[PDB]
Amino acid sequence: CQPIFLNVLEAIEPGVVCAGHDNNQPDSFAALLSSLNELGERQLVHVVKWAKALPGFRNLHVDDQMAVIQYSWMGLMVFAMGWRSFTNVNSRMLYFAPDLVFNEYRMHKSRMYSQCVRMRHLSQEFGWLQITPQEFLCMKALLLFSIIPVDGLKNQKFFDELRMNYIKELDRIIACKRKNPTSCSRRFYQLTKLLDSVQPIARELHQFTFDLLIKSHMVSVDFPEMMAEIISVQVPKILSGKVKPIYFHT
């Protein structure tokens, strides 16, 4: 029996994305953040292409397809970055891209050292919890459906159904080589805790990028078009409490 759902997730997983950063130049806040912004813009393109190819994504009202991407991109990208950091450099550095790897010096120069260490901790968890490539893929897909508005989506019912199905698929992946319901329960606990841990990090970054956008002109940090639009229109809805993450635990 072929794992249809997993086959799809592996097939649509985005390839390597480079930031275009000039690593020959001495590190500077403006250059580092401008490169992170450009990487965000480039990754956003891949996230949209990826999301549109996810099982059942098209069932969502188009307005909701837009919304979920606009609200969840930070978490999605941070989670994937954590996985790359673990797989490529054993969490020794933050692997934003092959050409944008953060050592402690860069974490400090970026002025978001605190957020960086939390992301490095997330990276370490992938190793400590022995997260499998398949669990990573399913969890990442679930992160796309983990933040919603209080006024509700155009069609909240279709979103709820899709989210439920992805949680169900995560269950199946957990039960794969586990014939003991208790072991499955313990694994589900671990993974939902990991998923929840992404949200506080994403919130800190949402706050940081929002503040940076507002003062970008005086710190020489460039924001690409899509990033600037999303950070000035959607991110504030998250920061003002109109859009909130769905936490498994309280």
């Binding site: 956003l44 393109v45 949209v48 292409k49 549109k52 188009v62 397809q65 837009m66 991407i69 606009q70 078009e225 899509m226 639009e229 999303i230």
Partner: peptide
């Protein structure tokens, strides 16, 4: 926006 165009 460019995102909307990308999505559609």
């Amino acid at each position: 926006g460019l995102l909307w165009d990308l999505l559609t």
